[PDB]
């Protein structure tokens, strides 16, 4: 369902007409889905060489339309309570340090590099704080 929008070529810079099977998760992310690594594995593990053609990937997406589409339905309200845990004065803000803590120390533990990449364009105020509702909105924008 989610269109390629010429993204496949960025994953295949070596003119193979195919991309690494291990790149499938990131490809799915690039076109608009938000799969867990587990979902990616279930999709592949279900004729699938070390690579996949665009047509093979499109076939996989059509078969898994509902499950992939289900990864794009998150709402801001799903995450506010989690941030409120780190909101000392109930100001709607969290320190950049606490955000890193949340993301690298809890849940699936993102890497410090992933958090660096995430925060590259995130506004941090003069108190080292981030408006988390605005942050969530940015992360969830399609």
């Amino acid at each position: 369902t989610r269109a390629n929008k010429d993204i496949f070529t960025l994953f295949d810079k070596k003119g193979q007409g195919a991309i690494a099977k291990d790149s499938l998760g990131d490809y799915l992310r690039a076109i608009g889905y938000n799969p867990t690594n587990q979902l990616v594995q279930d999709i592949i593990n279900a004729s699938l060489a070390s690579s996949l053609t665009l047509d093979q990937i499109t076939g996989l997406i059509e078969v898994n339309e509902k499950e992939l589409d289900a990864t794009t339905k998150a709402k801001t309200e799903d995450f506010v309570k989690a941030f409120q845990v780190f909101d000392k004065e109930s100001t709607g803000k969290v320190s950049v340090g606490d955000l890193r803590y949340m993301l690298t120390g809890l849940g699936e533990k993102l890497t410090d590099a992933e958090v660096d990449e995430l925060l590259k364009g995130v506004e941090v105020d003069s108190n080292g704080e981030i408006d988390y509702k605005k942050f969530i909105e940015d992360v969830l924008r399609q």
Binding site: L10, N34, K81, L103, L106, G107, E117
Partner: peptide
Amino acid sequence: QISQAIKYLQNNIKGFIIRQRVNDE
């Protein structure tokens, strides 16, 4: 609970990171 909420957010963050990267590329 927070663990579940954070995991769900992390999946979306991974999505966001890749989409920003593709834009930058």
